[PDB]
């Protein structure tokens, strides 16, 4: 329907044939079909028109909340509270926003899997590839942290990746 | 519920900001006190570790007798 977004959570264009039956003896589940339509389908769908009809009479908005952007870590005096406070708290805040995104990438997977029946290993395998990227991201920043992570941990994890980076760029360039 | 029992998160945020700024406060006092109490007890020369001597007023600036002393 309208409440998800179609580009978050992408789906094929749902190509389905047409019937064309080559016998004359009355096709089962049509008319199962048939009788299970006029009979839940119908009163199911009243329910919901009157419950609809009462919430148009009544209707109110809630509003996503916008957080602002505050400095971060890496410009954080030594021993400067507050500011290691907010910085934490940001990081915590991104922290969460991201492991929606893995979650968001594993849906998408796993709709992959389902979708392609038994043709998955090649039809979605770009799904796949989305997947490796953003869990090797993921891995990068918060892997080892541990438990009480905090954002002093992960700045200097990745203080460590870019020494280790910088060192093995240096020798490569004395090749 | 949110509005009958508790309140915005704004206020815990700026609550928890002031009571982190109070223990700083306290812990770089603590530390300063520790420093300067050391301080002046291996020197002497401040308000504190002050101990008595011999007051100058009990000397008797007068003939002795003798002419020496
Ligand atoms: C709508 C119907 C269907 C849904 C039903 C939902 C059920 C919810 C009711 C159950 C209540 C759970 C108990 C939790 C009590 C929380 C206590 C505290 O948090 O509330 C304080 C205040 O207390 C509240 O007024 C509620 C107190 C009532 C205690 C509940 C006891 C009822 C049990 C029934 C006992 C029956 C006795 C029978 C004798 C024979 C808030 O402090 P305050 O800083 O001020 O306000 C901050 C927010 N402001 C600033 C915006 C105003």
Redesign the pocket.
């Known amino acids: 329907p309208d409440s998800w977004d179609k580009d978050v959570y992408p789906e094929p264009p749902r190509r389905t044939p047409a019937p064309a039956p080559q016998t004359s003896l009355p096709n089962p589940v049509t008319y199962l079909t048939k009788i299970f339509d006029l009979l839940v389908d119908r009163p199911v769908t009243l329910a919901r028109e009157f419950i609809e009809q009462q919430h148009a009479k009544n209707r109110y908005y809630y509003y996503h909340r916008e957080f602002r952007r505050v400095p971060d870590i890496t410009e954080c005096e030594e021993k400067d509270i507050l500011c290691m406070f907010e910085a934490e708290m940001q990081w915590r805040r991104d922290y969460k926003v991201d492991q929606e995104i893995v979650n968001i990438i594993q849906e998408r997977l796993k709709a992959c899997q389902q979708r392609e029946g038994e043709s998955y290993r090649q039809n979605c395998a770009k799904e796949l590839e989305q997947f490796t990227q953003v869990s090797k991201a993921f891995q990068d920043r918060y892997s080892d942290l541990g438990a009480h992570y905090s954002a002093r941990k992960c700045l200097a994890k990745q203080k460590q990746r870019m020494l280790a980076e910088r060192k093995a760029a240096k020798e490569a360039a004395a090749a | ?1 949110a ?5 915005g998160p704004e206020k815990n945020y700026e609550k928890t900001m002031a009571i982190l700024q109070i223990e700083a406060e306290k812990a770089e006092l603590r530390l300063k006190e520790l420093e300067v109490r050391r301080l002046m007890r291996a020197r002497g020369d401040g308000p504190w570790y002050q101990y008595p001597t011999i007051d100058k007023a009990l000397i008797d600036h007068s003939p002795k007798t003798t002419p020496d002393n």
Do not use: C, E, Q, S
């Not at chain 2, 509005?3 to 309140?7: I, K, S």
């Open positions: 519920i509005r009958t029992f508790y309140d």
